[PDB]
Structures are given as C-alpha cells and as structure tokens.
Design a protein around this ligand. Sequence first.
Ligand SMILES: OC[C@H]1O[C@@H](O[C@H]2[C@H](O)[C@@H](O)[C@H](O)O[C@@H]2CO)[C@H](O)[C@@H](O)[C@@H]1O
Ligand code: NAG
Length: 431
Amino acid sequence: QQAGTNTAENHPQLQSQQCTTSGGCKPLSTKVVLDSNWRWVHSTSGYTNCYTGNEWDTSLCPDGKTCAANCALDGADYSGTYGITSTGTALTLKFVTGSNVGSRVYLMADDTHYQLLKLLNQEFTFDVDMSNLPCGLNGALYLSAMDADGGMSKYPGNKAGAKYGTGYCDSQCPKDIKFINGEANVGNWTETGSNTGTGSYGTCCSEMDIWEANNDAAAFTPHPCTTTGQTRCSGDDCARNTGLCDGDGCDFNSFRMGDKTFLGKGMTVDTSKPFTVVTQFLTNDNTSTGTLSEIRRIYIQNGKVIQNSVANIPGVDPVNSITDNFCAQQKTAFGDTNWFAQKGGLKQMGEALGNGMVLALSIWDDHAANMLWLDSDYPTDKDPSAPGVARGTCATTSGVPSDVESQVPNSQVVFSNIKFGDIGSTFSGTS
Ligand SMILES: OC[C@H]1O[C@@H](O[C@H]2[C@H](O)[C@@H](O)[C@H](O)O[C@@H]2CO)[C@H](O)[C@@H](O)[C@@H]1O
Ligand SMILES: *[C@@H]1O[C@H](CO)[C@@H](O)[C@H](O)[C@H]1NC(C)=O
C-alpha cells in the first residue's frame, strides 16, 4: 500500500521504561500506531475509497499488485474516530466509537519503526484497569514477530510501513488482513461481517499473549510457529493448528486450572480495581542465549505481592508457571492435542523472543467464538463438568458481538506504566 497525505498521521505518545539491576529504570519516548486494517484506504490520486464497508473497488483493485499501487493508507483521528487516547503514560482504548468497533495499536520506537523487544532472560510489567471491561470483551497486550519496518524492506509494494501500522501477523494466520507482503489480499474476497472480510492469503508468525482478559477471566499464552518471522500462507499452511502455527497455544487461566476464587471482582486479584501484572521469561542458564524454560507471573495490588495461582486439576502437577511439562500435562487432562510441542514448544517460542518482537495493545469482541474460550464454558459441545471446559463464570449466551456492541458500547480498558528489563528490576519489595 502507498502512504496517503490527506490526513496527517500523529502518533500518540506512550512512554515506557527500560530497567536494569544496577541502573534502575530509565524512560523511553515511545509512541503508538493504529493497525493498517482500521484505516481509510483510498486512491493515491484523490479521495475515492479503495475499500468501503466489507468490499473492495473492483476498478481500482482488480488484483493485489494493482491495488497496492493504486491505493493508499491515510492518517487517523485517534480519539475521534477510534476512541484511542493517551495521557502520555496511560493508554485508554474504548470499545465502540460511532460505527467503529475496537482497535489495535503497536508500540513505536520512533515515527517509522516499531519498538523491537528482546525479552529472553528479561521481564515485562504493566498496569491494567478492567473495571469497565465486562464479559464478552478482551483487552489484550501481546507480542508478535513482525518486522520493525512493517515489511517495507522485504516488499516493494509496501511504501507505507510501520508509520501506518502495516505488517501484522499472528499465530492464527488470519486471512482478514487487507495488505500482506505489499499486496492487497483481494483474491476470492469473502464478506464475513458488515466491515470485514477475508482473502486468499493469511499472515502467520509466532505470538506471545502476555495478557488476554476481562473483569471475569484472564489468560496468558505462548503460540510458537515453525517459521521464522512474518510469512504469507495459502491453503493448508493457513489451517489452524495443523498448519505452520500453534493457534491454541499453551494457556494458563487460573479459573480453568482450578482456582475459581483467585481473579475476578472482589477476589485475590480484584478486577474491580487497577493492578500490576509482571511476566518473566526465564532461560535454562540465566543468559540471553539460553533456551526459554519457564514463564512466570506475579501480580501486585495495593502494594501486596501476589504469587500466581496453583494448578488444581487431577493429573496435572500443582505448579504456577508455564513450562513444557505443564503444557504436556494440561493438554492431557483437558483432552486437547499438544500442537504447542509439535511446533517446538518453549524452545521455539524463545527463538522468536530472541529475535525481537513487536508489542500490540487491543480491545476487541469475537465473532467466531464469542469470547467463550476466555470467560465461559468452551467448547460448547463438551460437558461443562469435564476438566478444562469451564473458563469463567460468564453465561454461554454472552459475547455475541451484536449484543455487546449495543449493550455495553462505552466499555474500555486502560493500560499503563509499561516497563521492561532485567529480571527482578521492574519492581521492588521491602519489609
Ligand atoms: O479460537 C478461539 C481461541 O482459542 C483458544 O484456544 C482454545 C481452543 O480453541 C480450545 O479447543 C481449547 O479447549 O482451549 C484453548 C484455550 O482457550 C486460543 O488460545 C485463543 O487464542 C483463541 O482466540
Ligand atoms: C538461574 O536463576 C535462578 C533464579 O530464578 C536460580 O534458581 C538458578 O540457580 C540460576 N541458575 C544458574 C545456572 O545460575
């Protein structure tokens, strides 16, 4: 896609801190950028849309390469159109704004490069307020193995780059992405909703889901893929789980793992109020060249340090971190296949972390599964009593997008105090 000039692109500031054991924390003047899927796409010579609603203009966009040459991404009114605002250290993402639903932004080092995070033997910390984020919604903070320039160097057809939020990929190999590899994804375009559709290609890469949550339930989940970096897929390579990527991941949700009173309204981690979330990525030898061996989670609320809940499921060791062993045991007890290990488990996840990943923040509803996999019983054809089926207390009729968009459109999530660096250095303790 080309870079449009009808609307200036001014990225909101979102400061983060980089931390070391000896030096403490130092601020970075990072920014955020709206993902390309949400932007206005129009002819490079004017104001005519290349895409409107859920369909492309066949005149401007007869094939992918022609479309990418004729069509430009333009600047965005972050607050006005998309309900995205920043204080400079806290990002608020609103659910419905006019006819817009949800958003996704990326953390930027400067105006043309995403911030590349290398988190092996490191930790990531942030604060979250989910008081106004109910059943059926997801406020997510995650890492994807995207290129720092949004694909510009690899794909001549992409002249927009990270400045316009290009180059998404994730472990679900999504085919709903409009531009992939510098070409419009217009082949066999099929409508899937009022403003969405899918094309013949998907875009896949490894993903680390640090936080997917609402005030009823939370999960953190590595998704390794057999490839390295963003890759366009077609046909069976895009199929979920059986293709290049593990779409299911190895998840840790405290309610699913048998502690129904750990996290939620008025619980140990009280989701009615703000709290801090720490995630540490440990290697077998405590160096940044080692193999990823455990992912640990700590919470802090009202100054109390809260260790992660322990698994309480028959056949699963009572542990509170993600390791390859836990993943194998959980996949058995719950009756799911271990696609995670097939793609290479934590070691393959670590190689992606090592190579650097991009941070995404987003608010969304789920057309396919109604977020029931996060906060309800899932899958809907399994006994609500079997281990691994119940993931929260929300009703099985909740999360219908048409419903939540009418019922709770002013829902929002606030992410703040983003910090990363040496293990044990983004937070402290005392007696
Ligand atoms: O696609 C919805 C959701 O799936 C999540 O995986 C589920 C999987 O679908 C289900 O078969 C299994 O029982 O549980 C896992 C974990 O919830 C996946 O982790 C999500 O990213 C995805 O959005
Ligand atoms: C790595 O650090 C952990 C602290 O989490 C410690 O238990 C362990 O002994 C260290 N291992 C090595 C090889 O130093």
